Amino acid sequence: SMSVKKPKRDDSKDLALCSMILTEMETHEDAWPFLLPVNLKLVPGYKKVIKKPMDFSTIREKLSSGQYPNLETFALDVRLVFDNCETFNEDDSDIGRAGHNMRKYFEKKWTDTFK
């Protein structure tokens, strides 16, 4: 509360560390469904159904332009990519399985880097 603060966690490397994790996600072989925005002109249903589209390139732009106020807002966008994936794709599909793999891969990097 006012004048009552927990000890200060050093947040000065977070920007760089998030950037590294995003690079590791981008180079994973199952990243291909997620690298660029879904094409809203060419994928019927996606615009109407997915209210908040998100992808790795869009995450990169936001990060590199100071649009994440903290590391949790970054994690939320990453998870949104996989939540969107799950909404639109059958679990029993290549893209569905890609999303599951990538989510797990991310959550490990995240825990190991910060928790």
Please report the DSSP string for 79-105 in residue order.
HHHHHHHHHHS-SSSHHHHHHHHHHHH
CA-CA distance, 71 to 17, in Å (whole number)? 9
Measured in whole angstroms, the distance separating CA 98 from the mean position of its chain's CA atoms is 14
CA-CA distance, 110 to 105, in Å (whole number)? 9
> Which residue shows structure tokens 């996606």?
46
CA-CA distance, 31 to 21, in Å (whole number)? 13
Resolution of this structure in Å: 2.0
Exp. method: X-ray
Each domain of the chain, given as residue ranges in start order, spans 1-115
- Mention every residue, 6+ apart, whose C-beta is less than 8 A from residue 68: 18, 62, 74, 77
- Look at residues 62, 57, 59, 64 and name the one whose alpha carbon lies nearest to residue 79: 59
CATH number of this structure's domain 1-115: 1.20.920.10
Q: What is the largest CA-CA distance in the chain?
A: 54
CA-CA distance, 68 to 104, in Å (whole number)? 22
- Copy the structure tokens of residue 84: 């969107």
- Residue 35 contacts residue 55 (beta carbons within 8 Å): yes
